[PDB]
């Protein structure tokens, strides 16, 4: 699998592929690895499917309980800290998962958490089997003076490179830009196909 | 000698359960009703002194973005019970993945109140709640007794203004009704009961229409209905 | 016949909760109010004899460098409750990484008091607290009841001088106010209540402005306001 | 009918906490005060009969080589509480490696007394203690209440001779004082209170100066002050 | 209504502790004293009927070959407490390898009695013991109260013949004394108290000299002192 | 007001222990004595109606093939206690491999009765037992009190016929005696007490001689002594 | 990774690098390994990221609770003793971390604690993958008669040598001098770049 | 190590060597492996030192508690049964010890207990590293019609053979004859040296 | 590491080196392995650093609690028995430590305890990596008719031989003579350097 998360000026963009295997044997050509975890932050998936979905369910539950108790959204440092403490209360029966949570509260963030609960701030991050490819292209092309359209084009070029050069990733890309103004918006697949055909990465 | 502990009477009445019900007659009045495509809650807000923070005092307390609750009686038992209802709803959202029926939630909360009715060495909850929200079935509206009794209503009330409101609602309530006229009927109900302070107030009102989430009104919109 | 244990009355009142109230009426008076960019606490300090160490007797007890507390009533229940509030705040700082809302802290402390209200075989806490501090929302100021009731105030008091102070504060309090004039108003409030010993004292006063930490005043600065 | 169990009064007083006080008024009197670079404890020793081993009867009981304790009230509760204070001090010496502040020790001991004040089915400790010793802060001198109330003093007393001593010490105590004159003042205090048996005794006296350990005096040195 | 459970009085006295005392006043009298290089216990043995096995009735019950015990009061509580003292002494012989001080043993036994004084739902032990033996320090002689109070004596007694014996021992006891004259003084003490049955009996007597073990006397030697 | 629970009297008596005694005075009488090389038990058997199975009604109940027991008082407490004595004897036979001393067994059974004397919320055992048998020491014969008091006798009794039997046995008992004459003396004892029904019965009698096991007599042999 | 802690006359200087890997695959070019643990002492990180951050959270919490109970700062011997007892209550499910805590109370200290909780006093210490390099240069150049500027220059030369000769360390150095007078001050990155360009270790 | 226990007519003789290793590396040339467990029986040691000393402490405690409860000494069958039940309540975290308890109650016994708690009666027994040597010489020279002096001479010849032909055993022999008449008497080392010089086993 | 403990006429002398490694990689040239455990006895360290320091903390605590309960110092047999029972209540999660406790109560002792809790009395003992060297020189030069100065000179010669012929030991020697008269006195390092320069073992 692969993930990507890119922080720019006043937004943060995350995207995954949708191919679940679960065997060698690619079994599901349309899964779901990008989740809305709250109204201003989301969470991606790059690990064992069952453990990752249980962590998504628990974090949806805990953040909704949080916002319903305090009427304020959770800070991104707080959600990564909570996720790190949860993953590190059990590490000798651990969750084989590589999580990545990003979102905006007063400034956009994207955080990475490994299977032992190591939280660390960075402006662009990625996890999964097809991770070094998207790190390569993000290192080569990424600038922090981009717009939202330039950011999502960079994301689509990244995940397209990972699909062309990796076996585990593949299938249709789904992308969701989360910003302070419009809130959590997941792009429809028709606009994503339009961006792919505009960039000329289709075959 | 007339049995003040959770045991039975020689006619067969639970006296501590009773005495907790007359505790919740002293509470703040509140009301709910179903309308055409949803359900609304309306809570009276008797702002006694001018020192209390007028905004953040809330009786309409959300359990989820699709189930809401408003209460009457002992406010500490209210807050603890609403917290238990929140964690029970979130455990259902963990386990079964979605909140399919609000009836499971109100039955678990009512059984939690029953457990303190039942055993000895603990007083019952002196608190009465109504739940509202939509689910797979539709717009629902429950009640919750200190005994644990639940009843699903089309339109109900709770608190000190019980009897006058339920008399107004057996007289004048209609089943399917648009939201503006329904909340006008609710304000007329609350004014019909609360004509002992010769002023109503600006209360707090909330609603949901199926497919949407909760729209708790601000201070400025509720004064336009008034 | 008249029920001295945590069970209900035939009108619906908790007698031991009353009796832990009116215990808190015997305590030392204390006060808090919000000002322009923060919140202040002012605690009376009735130094009775001349043997007691004048400096280290503290009623303004910090929970964190962004939440403070001052108390009234039974001082042992006060110290145990403040210790539980400290360890609860530090557990929130472990788990969620930062103290986002002070309301979670005061609700956990109030539910801890509720648990001893609820079950049998333990008395309630005979203690009443107010919490103050800033968070992501802003400057906050709570109260805490032996029942567990919390109320967020703009300006409140606690202790033996309850009624005269809250009368002065319904008469003369203004919302947004600089810190020097606000603490002058607070000393005038405490002098208005405590005119039965015909001398006020040198009290202890503390404040916080948002972005900063607690500046508990020394002995020398508070005498210049007096 | 007037509430003899750890529950509240209709004016809000803990009756068993009173009754564990006025038990501690029947105890043996004791005293402590701070001097120039340390703190001293002086314990009266009413040797009633001539059979009791005059040497090994000790009321000044060490908790550590830098914290000491002397007690009054029920002597069995005293011994159990001093043993808990010893194991708590040694657990702090395990966990934090050094005894940095004696205040943590007296607060844990006082919360241990609070735990039996709080719950039902156990009587409070009928015992009152004062702690003395030096730390990183300096020479400290606490008190301990059957309620759990602690107060840091410059100079205090405990036991049957409470009031006459504290009157002498509001009249005649000075802050910074050499050790010989301070213990002469303490013997004069104990003689001022105990003028009902028309003889004082040879009491037991102990001191510490910061940087040193405890020098409990023998029988021969205390007779030279007398 | 005058307080019959282990709780406090309004003057501050534990009435069940008193009532376990004055139970121990009904017991059979016993005595101990220190002599020149050791300690002796002397126990009266009121053989009432002629059916009871004259030899094997023992009230000199060894805890170890270097600590002995004689009791008075309720004999079942005596036997249970002596069994607990035996297993506590043997646990100390496991853990610390030798019995260095008998004071740890008597303090653990006294705290065991304190635990049933303290909590509710259990009566105290109606039993009073004195311990004797040598250690690293020397010949020791303790007492044990149903309250848990211990006192180290040069010479003491226990049982029904308390007051007359302790009067004889404030009148006529000397500190350092050979064993034959000391046990003659002890028999004279027991005869001074027990002059109400106008015959003493043949009692049972035991001793230890430091470096040796217990020499409980047979029937034939004790009749030669008599 | 006169204390019916396992707590103390103002003179120092356990009233429930008395009331469990005087319950055991209503039981069936029984007896034991030592003879030349062993010990015998003799149990009266008041066969009231002619419907009860004459053979299988047993009061002499074996604990082991070298320790026997016979009881009086509440027969259900008797059966439960004899079952606990059996499993305790068999646990000793597991752990220490042989039953060296019967005294450990009777002391564990007596401490089991003490545990229900001691704690609250359970009544004592209303049952009184005597144990008999041989060991490494020799023929032993104990008694067991509802208080837990044990006494080793040469010859004793238990049940309703206590006083008349123990008067006969202070008058006429001899120490070393052959078995036939000893059991004739025992039948004469039981006839001396039970001369109120003007007929004795055919009782059940059992014995052991050291080196052998229990020879409970049949119906035909006991009628030849009668 | 690498750490360094140097005690001089009336101050103690600690610094780490900022590069987190978490894989082989250096993933985060700007992490955080130097933490303010109290107003007069700090703590560095040279172990597994999740376990180390959980230990930082717990020690921040415990020292703040401590100072809030007693109104006195914790001694450095006390914080190392507490950390040693915590790490040695669990060593068969241990934290794979090499901690180093330094600070000043009445005299400056820097202490080292391994994964089994061995506390030991020393005047200069270091932990991490790039540790023997900075021990070499500290052994060769270090004197106890240095000033604060000479100390922080020695620290920058040390960590620059570790970056030039190690793979695991790298990225921008951050340094914080903790002294009794000014309290905990972390140097801004502009002054650190000025010191690097003055010493001429830039390329 | 080595032990020996010999039952004769009206006495039982036990002896060990005194050399404790605890490493390969013989470390203590004067230990203690022969213990008085009661006034009429003793216990020898041939196992792991810590476990064996803990078992000696526990059995001293239990037998003293026994005699103090019942005023009778414990039978030898009873002490071996107790020791067997104690060692067999825990055998999957076992004590690596080979115990041997002997004494006289109404007839002399010497019993052997392995690490799993197998008690077995025999008239002569031995345990330890240097055990088959003393079994050889006891099988070749032992008769049950010996006196106490002949018995202790046979014991000294046995342990001297084990010292001359084994590495683990060595050091000065200590012997204690336990009989019904004189009770537990441990022979002084001067008499043991006199018996060695009389038998001519010295070099 | 190395330790040494020597009993003479009316005193007992213990000394260790100070070099802690904690890796291969000697890391701390000045540690602390000689501890005052009570006013008349001390304890040395030759094991894993964390476990050994936790045992030192616990035994300081327990002996201080002991003396404060009974107003008598603990016997040396009692402290070794307590330490043996503590180490043998847990041996399947054991402390990898080789302790050595010595002191004087009415006669001087020095006791050795391995990781399984085997206590054994001896007049001279040593533990650690550099142990057989100091056992060699103690066996060759030691006599029980020495004075305190001759004893501490023998100790310094021993630990100097262990430093010259072992890698794990090293650094400055610290020595503390504990006697009945002066109590626990640790020698200052200046006197130790004077004794080294007098014996001529310096280079």
Swiss-Prot record, chains A, G, H, I:
GO MF terms held by the record: endopeptidase activity; threonine-type endopeptidase activity
EC class name: hydrolase
GO biological-process terms attached to the record: proteasomal protein catabolic process
PROSITE patterns, alphabetized: PROTEASOME_BETA_1 (PS00854), PROTEASOME_BETA_2 (PS51476)
UniProt cross-references to InterPro entries, sorted A to Z: Ntn_hydrolases_N (IPR029055), Pept_T1A_Psome_bsu_arc (IPR019983), Pept_T1A_subB (IPR000243), Proteasome_bsu_CS (IPR016050), Proteasome_sua/b (IPR001353), Proteasome_suB-type (IPR023333)
Regulation: The formation of the proteasomal ATPase PAN-20S proteasome complex, via the docking of the C-termini of PAN into the intersubunit pockets in the alpha-rings, triggers opening of the gate for substrate entry. Interconversion between the open-gate and close-gate conformations leads to a dynamic regulation of the 20S proteasome proteolysis activity.
Protein's cellular compartments: Cytoplasm
UniProt KW keywords: Autocatalytic cleavage, Cytoplasm, Hydrolase, Protease, Proteasome, Threonine protease, Zymogen
Catalytic activity: Cleavage of peptide bonds with very broad specificity
UniProt keyword annotation of NAD present: no
Active site, per annotation: 1
Enzyme Commission identifier(s): 3.4.25.1
GO CC annotation, single: proteasome core complex, beta-subunit complex
Superkingdom classification of source: Archaea
Oligomer status and interactors: The 20S proteasome core is composed of 14 alpha and 14 beta subunits that assemble into four stacked heptameric rings, resulting in a barrel-shaped structure. The two inner rings, each composed of seven catalytic beta subunits, are sandwiched by two outer rings, each composed of seven alpha subunits. The catalytic chamber with the active sites is on the inside of the barrel. Has a gated structure, the ends of the cylinder being occluded by the N-termini of the alpha-subunits. Is capped at one or both ends by the proteasome regulatory ATPase, PAN.
NCBIfam families: arc_protsome_B
Note: The configuration of the closed gate contains an opening large enough to allow rapid entry of tetrapeptides but able to impede the entry of proteins and longer peptides.
Function: Component of the proteasome core, a large protease complex with broad specificity involved in protein degradation. The T.acidophilum proteasome is able to cleave oligopeptides after Tyr, Leu, Phe, and to a lesser extent after Glu and Arg. Thus, displays chymotrypsin-like activity and low level of caspase-like and trypsin-like activities.
Family: Belongs to the peptidase T1B family.
Protein name: Proteasome subunit beta
Swiss-Prot record, chains B, C, D, E, F:
One GO biological process term: ubiquitin-dependent protein catabolic process
Location(s), subcellular: Cytoplasm
Phenotype upon changing residue 59 to A: Prevents PAN to associate with the proteasome and stimulate gate opening
Cytoplasm recorded as keyword: yes
SMART domains on file: Proteasome_A_N
PTM: The N-terminus is blocked.
Molecular function GO terms recorded: endopeptidase activity; threonine-type endopeptidase activity
Predominant localisation class: cytoplasm
Gene3D superfamilies documented for this protein: Glutamine Phosphoribosylpyrophosphate, subunit 1, domain 1 (3.60.20.10)
Pfam families listed in its UniProt record: Proteasome, Proteasome_A_N
Effect after changing residue 74 to A/E/G: Prevents PAN to stimulate gate opening
Keywords associated with the record: Cytoplasm, Proteasome
GO cellular component terms, semicolon-separated: cytoplasm; proteasome core complex, alpha-subunit complex
Annotated consequence of substituting residue 75 to A: No effect on PAN's ability to stimulate gate opening
Regulation: The formation of the proteasomal ATPase PAN-20S proteasome complex, via the docking of the C-termini of PAN into the intersubunit pockets in the alpha-rings, triggers opening of the gate for substrate entry. Interconversion between the open-gate and close-gate conformations leads to a dynamic regulation of the 20S proteasome proteolysis activity.
HAMAP family, per the entry: Proteasome_A_A
Family: Belongs to the peptidase T1A family.
Comment field (misc): The configuration of the closed gate contains an opening large enough to allow rapid entry of tetrapeptides but able to impede the entry of proteins and longer peptides.
Function: Component of the proteasome core, a large protease complex with broad specificity involved in protein degradation. The T.acidophilum proteasome is able to cleave oligopeptides after Tyr, Leu, Phe, and to a lesser extent after Glu and Arg. Thus, displays chymotrypsin-like activity and low level of caspase-like and trypsin-like activities.
Subunit structure as annotated in this protein's UniProt entry: The 20S proteasome core is composed of 14 alpha and 14 beta subunits that assemble into four stacked heptameric rings, resulting in a barrel-shaped structure. The two inner rings, each composed of seven catalytic beta subunits, are sandwiched by two outer rings, each composed of seven alpha subunits. The catalytic chamber with the active sites is on the inside of the barrel. Has a gated structure, the ends of the cylinder being occluded by the N-termini of the alpha-subunits. Is capped at one or both ends by the proteasome regulatory ATPase, PAN.
Name of protein: Proteasome subunit alpha
